[PDB]
Amino acid sequence: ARIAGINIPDHKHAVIALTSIYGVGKTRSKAILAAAGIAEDVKISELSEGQIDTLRDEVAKFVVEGDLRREISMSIKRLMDLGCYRGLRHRRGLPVRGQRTKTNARTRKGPRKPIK
Amino acid sequence: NQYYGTGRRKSSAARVFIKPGNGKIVINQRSLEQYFGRETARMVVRQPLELVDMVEKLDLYITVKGGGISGQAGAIRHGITRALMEYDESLRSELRKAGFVTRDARQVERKKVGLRKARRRPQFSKR
Amino acid sequence: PRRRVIGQRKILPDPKFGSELLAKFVNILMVDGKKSTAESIVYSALETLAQRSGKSELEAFEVALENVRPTVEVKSRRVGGSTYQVPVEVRPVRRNALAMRWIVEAARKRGDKSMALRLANELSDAAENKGTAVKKREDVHRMAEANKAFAHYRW
Amino acid sequence: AKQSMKAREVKRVALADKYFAKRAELKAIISDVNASDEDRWNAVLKLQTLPRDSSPSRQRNRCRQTGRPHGFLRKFGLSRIKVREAAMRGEIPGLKKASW
Amino acid sequence: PRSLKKGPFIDLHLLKKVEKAVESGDKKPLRTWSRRSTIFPNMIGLTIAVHNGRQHVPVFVTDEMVGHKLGEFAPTRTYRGH
Amino acid sequence: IRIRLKAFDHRLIDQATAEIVETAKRTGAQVRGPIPLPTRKERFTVLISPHVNKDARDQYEIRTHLRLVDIVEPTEKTVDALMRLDLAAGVDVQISL
Amino acid sequence: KRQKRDRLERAHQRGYQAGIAGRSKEMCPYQTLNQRSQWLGGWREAMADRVVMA
Amino acid sequence: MQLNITGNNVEITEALREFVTAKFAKLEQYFDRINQVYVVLKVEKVTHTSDATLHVNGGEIHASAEGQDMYAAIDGLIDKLARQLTKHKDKLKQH
RNA sequence: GGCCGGGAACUCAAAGGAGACUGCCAGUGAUAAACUGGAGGAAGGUGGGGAUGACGUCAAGUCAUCAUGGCCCUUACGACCAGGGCUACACACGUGCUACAAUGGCGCAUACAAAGAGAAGCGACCUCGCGAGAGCAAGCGGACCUCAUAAAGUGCGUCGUAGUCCGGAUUGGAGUCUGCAACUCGACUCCAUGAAGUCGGAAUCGCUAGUAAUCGUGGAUCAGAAUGCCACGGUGAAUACGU
Ligand SMILES: [Mg+2]
Ligand SMILES: [Mg+2]
Ligand SMILES: [Mg+2]
Ligand SMILES: [Mg+2]
Ligand SMILES: [Mg+2]
Ligand SMILES: [Mg+2]
Ligand SMILES: [Mg+2]
Ligand SMILES: [Mg+2]
Ligand SMILES: [Mg+2]
Ligand SMILES: [Mg+2]
Ligand SMILES: [Mg+2]
Ligand SMILES: [Mg+2]
Ligand SMILES: [Mg+2]
Ligand SMILES: [Mg+2]
Ligand SMILES: [Mg+2]
Ligand SMILES: [Mg+2]
Ligand SMILES: [Mg+2]
Ligand SMILES: [Mg+2]
């Protein structure tokens, strides 16, 4: 139960388990387990090395883990270096997509900094 | 020689026809146990019969339009109790004592201005 | 209220066991208007009560109910700076309502998987003087016994 | 409302329903997937040219009595205030206080 | 964002006066209020000073600035902190 | 032929009906029963204060009344007359063959 | 809320309460001899109980 | 005691803010369980006014006072709340 | 297939009527007024809900709906335009929404409403697309056509008490639609991401019955932009000894 150089839960339905891969959600999970004709309800523990490989193959079709994490980080570095409004939202650590800040906005800003 | 009631509860209306027979029931071209999943519903529909043991001595036929389940179920009961005390002007008094003959009336209250519902009114904290 | 409330309601009896008593018990467990959901949870508990006591259902669920009904409760009353707890008889219908409430309250506060399990276990434990439900009654009774001196005030 | 503000609404209506067709057909090609890239690109430059106040989205329903920009009702073309004032005289046929 | 079928939006005034920039090679900055307009490839290499509300501010266009909309480079509020 | 009658008053409409189902009888024809139809009830809510005070309203209404009348066996005579009738103001009619 | 409580019972408990709190008979607000009997009846029952209270 | 200041036709400077806060700090000695409290200052023509409302542990206390200044208004106000707060306390500590 | 000829019963539509008055019967009561109970009845004592707000109070609110006493401005406090701002964020308070799970999440299957809107508007069926949508174009000024398949419910399966198959904030990428135009500042879609949150201190609010709780539906405003507002049904409790 090692895919994309990470350990996958072996007591979880393949569908659920494959999601542990960063860069596969649930849509991809479903696809994989059909593109690589493997059943959904099957737990990973009760497979063949063979099954696990054809599976290993499907996942390689996507960009995932390390690879992905790099892509994202480029995209954000790209913005900040451009210095666009969207860039600075990322710098100053503020809602990048137009959300109000007068109130709320605590997910970017993090927990409260009292006064004085 | 078939005996008839109408019957209403909340937003439901139930037109019913009874006939002498062995104890069949149809609702909207369907059987009792099919049309009504909930058990309560069934109890309600037959309890006028279960009262005056004609449960299997008359054969009923029904249609309902409007309302939800407990509405229709209720509306039917009223429908029967009407017909069943028309086939027999006799039974009324017994039927009536069970409180089946009265039409419920309880309707949903309107929404009013200033309120979140009929009577629920928005909070204001003295906190 | 200051006047008298006129017009008591009509609980229809249970579809199965045809009891107004059990019908009340459902309402009390019922949440957010979901009467069917509650109707299920209740029967599945009694099954599993019946399947161990082997003593019917409308006669087993009772035995739980007797182990837990209180007979004397305390009312609070402000006297000087202090507050007098004072013992009072309980009305029959009230001690039904309390037993049924305490059973439900005790059920929910458990770690079992289903709701049905929690209810079942609780009803069983009730029948053998055990659970939180029955603990509560004991405590109520302790308090009224303690400050018995204030039995006859009318104040 | 300031006389000026009432006025703009007339300037804006008049244009809107004079260039109405020009806009429509000049838009129609834009949204045509199956048309000449040459054509559609021209259009995009041509629409933006003819005047802003000639767009129907540019106008604002104002009470046609007092000029108010808020609380308008279409059925009457009046503000909530003037609707009430007239309602009570019986200058709005049919209309009357309601209960249920 | 704007539908893909309707193509990329640029105000004509500004579209024109970056032919004369690119054909008749100049090297001046251009004034503009056209914060709508997306940056086209032609615009690469030419500073263009876009309005922010009170002032025009220079945007030396680059490859990376293509598709974005001028005004996405002229901040319009001032904030240092509290 | 069908005519649909529509108005805001109910007394008013129950005139025009009787008027028409008199002529139809007159100029020899069978008139298929004045049948009434659902009445539409447009409703309106309005702030009655000119400033603030959101929870102070009026609720207005207009009830529209619809009636339908048919013409079974249209006499030639009738078609002119049922067309040529000056009918109470504040009533819409829609004779349509 | 839907219907007024028993007038006689209320009159008997009003009597009791003036009793315990130690008002004089002849504060009784009733001349209706029926209610009056209830009021005093309470007031005299209460006179007993005061003794064994402090 | 959480405070809040308004100005209806008055600019709250940083005397009038500092001043009002100090004057209100006394009130807690009259009743320890004061919660949030709102203050309002007015100038209508020639009349200087100051009202406050005080959420307290089982109550709501309000008073308003008129001065020829706002300081003299607020001075007056603090004397009004003092008396009300004491009355409140004493009908709780009622033994 | 009310589908067809028929039928005018029934449901329903809406004009007109009938009906409830302490009228009838006990007991109490000053031979009163009334009260408590009983009968019949769909309904019983103001049956339920709405509309309706006394003389006045608070120099309460509105000169920014409009009107208007006075005062002030008149190559500017008037008028036009482009861009920005009202959407800013160390923070404090109020009103809400969604959650924290198993009376639950997810997948398949399958029941039962009400009320309302539509004219250059509501827009089916067909084709395309994973999807938002696109193209083509029937019907309907509407008890006829369209919005527009109610949801909770129900059966069968699965998850097995985990920060989880709970939650869905945040952010990247890729789109659609409205609109001269969505950078500042729209709604929505797909792929990925998967935060705080394990039921909330002191305090504090709503509600007495088809109510609270909970579940869906519509409308006004409106090119586009509801978790708000105004309406509509479904399921449907708890408890009132008492002062
Ligand atoms: Mg996703
Ligand atoms: Mg409000
Ligand atoms: Mg509701
Ligand atoms: Mg004017
Ligand atoms: Mg507009
Ligand atoms: Mg309509
Ligand atoms: Mg002083
Ligand atoms: Mg009676
Ligand atoms: Mg009156
Ligand atoms: Mg004033
Ligand atoms: Mg402008
Ligand atoms: Mg604002
Ligand atoms: Mg909520
Ligand atoms: Mg989830
Ligand atoms: Mg609409
Ligand atoms: Mg398709
Ligand atoms: Mg009440
Ligand atoms: Mg809702």
Side-chain angles (χ1 to χ4, degrees), chain D residues 36 39-90:
Chain D
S36 311
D39 280 313
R40 302 200 279 108
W41 176 247
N42 297 314
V44 165
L45 283 326
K46 184 60 180 156
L47 178 57
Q48 67 167 261
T49 294
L50 51 79
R52 281 191 192 184
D53 279 19
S54 72
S55 181
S57 291
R58 191 90 175 166
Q59 45 230 50
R60 183 72 187 227
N61 290 324
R62 322 181 88 103
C63 178
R64 62 166 84 145
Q65 270 203 21
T66 197
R68 219 174 94 109
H70 269 310
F72 175 86
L73 301 177
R74 287 179 175 192
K75 184 55 163 270
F76 314 111
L78 298 172
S79 81
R80 57 191 187 74
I81 290 173
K82 302 273 55 168
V83 160
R84 180 154 179 262
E85 290 191 18
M88 301 324 272
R89 288 191 277 248

Side-chain angles (χ1 to χ4, degrees), chain F residues 34-41 43-51 53-65 67-71 74 81:
Chain F
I35 170 76
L37 280 152
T39 150
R40 172 186 152 73
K41 308 199 189 195
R43 283 176 181 177
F44 311 90
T45 312
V46 292
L47 276 58
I48 64 169
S49 169
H51 190 266
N53 300 339
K54 179 60 154 284
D55 279 338
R57 306 292 187 111
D58 278 356
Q59 278 165 342
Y60 299 132
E61 177 165 73
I62 304 164
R63 298 188 190 196
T64 317
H65 303 251
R67 262 45 162 191
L68 185 70
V69 181
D70 273 13
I71 296 300

Side-chain angles (χ1 to χ4, degrees), chain A residues 59-60 62-64 66-69:
Chain A
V59 171
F62 307 105
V63 32
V64 142
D67 309 312
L68 170 52
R69 337 194 92 118

Side-chain angles (χ1 to χ4, degrees), chain H residues 31-50:
Chain H
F31 183 86
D32 59 292
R33 304 283 265 99
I34 302 165
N35 299 300
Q36 43 201 246
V37 20
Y38 309 79
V39 179
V40 187
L41 312 185
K42 309 218 167 198
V43 177
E44 316 314 305
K45 306 273 277 290
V46 307
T47 69
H48 303 256
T49 309
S50 62

Side-chain angles (χ1 to χ4, degrees), chain B residues 95-115 117-121:
Chain B
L95 281 175
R96 171 144 211 117
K97 181 175 171 176
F100 290 168
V101 61
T102 174
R103 190 266 138 120
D104 213 314
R106 301 186 296 136
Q107 308 291 74
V108 24
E109 228 166 307
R110 62 174 287 183
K111 186 175 166 282
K112 302 170 192 70
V113 161
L115 290 308
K117 291 174 77 209
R119 296 194 187 181
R120 206 208 183 299
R121 75 187 320 111

